[PDB]
Amino acid sequence: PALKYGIVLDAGSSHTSMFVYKWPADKENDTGIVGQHSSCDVQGGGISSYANDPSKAGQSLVRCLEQALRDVPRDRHASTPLYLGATAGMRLLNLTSPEATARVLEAVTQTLTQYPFDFRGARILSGQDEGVFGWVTANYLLENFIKYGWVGRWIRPRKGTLGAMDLGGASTQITFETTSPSEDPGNEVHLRLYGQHYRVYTHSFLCYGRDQILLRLLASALQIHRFHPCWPKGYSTQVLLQEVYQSPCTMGQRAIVSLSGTSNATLCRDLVSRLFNISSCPFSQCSFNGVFQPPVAGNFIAFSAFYYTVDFLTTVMGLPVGTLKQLEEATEITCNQTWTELQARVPGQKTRLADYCAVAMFIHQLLSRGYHFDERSFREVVFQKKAADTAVGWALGYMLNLTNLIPADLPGLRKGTHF
Ligand SMILES: Nc1ncnc2c1ncn2[C@@H]1O[C@H](COP(=O)(O)O)[C@@H](O)[C@H]1O
Ligand SMILES: [Ca+2]
């Protein structure tokens, strides 16, 4: 079996990752056939972090691109497509400066074009793209697009699909198949995949990614309390105010100030609750901030920082998260830890440690009060970051779309046997 390869650079707000995928040439249109071959994490910040030094953005890719040259056989370099897709870090920079955004894209394009891969462009994905391609990735990998059964006995209803929830650094996405009528065209997605129609809801909440929420909570704590109730008692840091308020996500709030934590789970809950506006809804039903959302339904996979945060609660804190009530309890216990108590649980590097309480509280509120999961619907959510040896994110679905590897219809319409 002769193999083909494809590469996606996922240029996220907080960092870039490279994924190399491989598939058999003769089976390339089968669902689930493409899988991850290798990956590489680019050292340092996201490409948007080089807004004032755009030349560095291209150079930042060099070491991982050098790895791609070793990972993909030489004779196949020329015919291996390479894409770069950038998400909310670049969407935010584009609000601030379309010129600086264009210079970054120019710098990554110049670097990528120097390599022997078939470079197919650097683009900024829409929030819809990001949500939908993640949903496609999960369902493709798990073979949910297969028509199950056989002639005269098809499973009915059709095999369910897995909803997707992605918590990145700068935005968060929710995407799932729905039978509810569409009320907002911006949220409505129709896919034709392997002869089947999927009616899908998606939304991306810009500024509701992990890093931006943490900045917004810090801005809020500074204004309301002058201490940080989500940070652990005994933890303090010198906050440079310029960095706090420079983001599009925090400009709305408002040189160095000392800020200390207080382990106040109840005040932390109150601070997080200010992130969700539930006061108004121009639709029949909303999530929050007046965004249309039908009832959540079916199974979901929650990946990226949902997975990393829950993994911390289960593996480091040793707490169950099987129910919303358990997640709330685990958040409380975590937020009530002092800095010495929390450090005692983590023998190694301590980066991100002071932030788990806030992120866990955010996640719990986002799911329960934002998306309106309840105990029944939450039981259907799993936290995982990989399926079939492949990282779950939008990259695979993006590559499948741009390489035209998912057919709208089966060959010869399968003689019409799925009609
Ligand atoms: N081990 C971790 N614990 C908590 N957050 C993380 C971890 N690894 C990455 N993150 C954060 O998760 C967010 C999305 O990460 P990613 O989906 O890997 O780009 C970013 O804010 C990252 O800093
Ligand atoms: Ca991401």
Residue 17 contacts residue 39 (beta carbons within 8 Å): yes
The per-residue DSSP string of 234-300 comes to: T-EEEEEHHHHHSSTTTTT---EEEEEE---HHHHHHHHHTT---S--SSSSBSSTT-B-PPP-S-E
Residue nearest to atom 20 of ligand 1 (CA): 169
Q: How was this structure determined?
A: X-ray
The number of the ligand 1 atom at minimal distance from the alpha carbon of 393 is: 17
Q: What resolution in Å is listed for this PDB structure?
A: 1.8
Angle at 24 between CA 42 and CA 163, to 5 degrees: 60
Task: Return the closest-CA partner of residue 418 out of 54, 75, 57, 156.
Answer: 156
Active site residues: 130
Task: Return the closest-CA partner of residue 350 out of 341, 327, 219, 243.
Answer: 341
Residues 6+ apart with CB under 8 A from 162: 135, 138, 139, 142, 144, 298, 299, 300, 301
C-alpha of residue 155 to centroid of ligand 1, in Å: 39
Residue 140 contacts residue 28 (beta carbons within 8 Å): no
Strands 3-11 and 81-86: parallel
Q: Is 166 helix (H, G, I), strand (E, B) or coil?
A: strand
Give the Cα separation of 103 and 115 in Å (integer): 19
**Ligand number nearest to the C-alpha of 308:** 1
Sign of the Cα torsion 385, 388, 389, 394 reads: negative
For residue 43, give the DSSP letter: S
Structure tokens, 152 = 């005269």
Residue 136 contacts residue 400 (beta carbons within 8 Å): yes
Residues 6+ apart with CB under 8 A from 150: none
For residue 115, give the DSSP letter: S
For ligand 2, an ion, list residues with CB under 5 A: 12, 168
- Count of C-beta atoms within a 10 Å radius of residue 342: 25
- For residue 46, CA distances in Å to 118, 144, 312, 335 come to 23, 33, 24, 29
For residue 409, give the DSSP letter: S
User: Best substitution site from 172, 352, 394 to test ligand 1's pocket, by max atoms within 8 Å of Cβ?
Assistant: 352
- Count of C-beta atoms within a 10 Å radius of residue 407: 14
Strands 256-261 and 228-233: parallel
User: Best substitution site from 39, 215, 308 to test ligand 1's pocket, by max atoms within 8 Å of Cβ?
Assistant: 308
The number of the ligand 1 atom at minimal distance from the alpha carbon of 17 is: 19
Q: Tokens 């949902």 sit at which residue? A: 306
Domains and CATH numbers, the chain: 1-125+389-419 (3.30.420.40), 126-388 (3.30.420.150)
- Measuring from each residue's beta carbon to the nearest atom of ligand 1, which residues come in under 6 Å? 12, 14-15, 168-169, 210-211, 304-305, 308-309, 352
Residues 6+ apart with CB under 8 A from 70: none
Residue 303 contacts residue 166 (beta carbons within 8 Å): yes
The four Cα atoms 317, 321, 326, 331 give a dihedral, to 10 degrees, of 50
Task: Return the closest-CA partner of residue 135 out of 298, 312, 4.
Answer: 298
Structure tokens, 86 = 């950038």
Residues tagged in the binding site annotation: 169-173
Give the Cα separation of 57 and 121 in Å (integer): 15
Residue 140 contacts residue 397 (beta carbons within 8 Å): yes
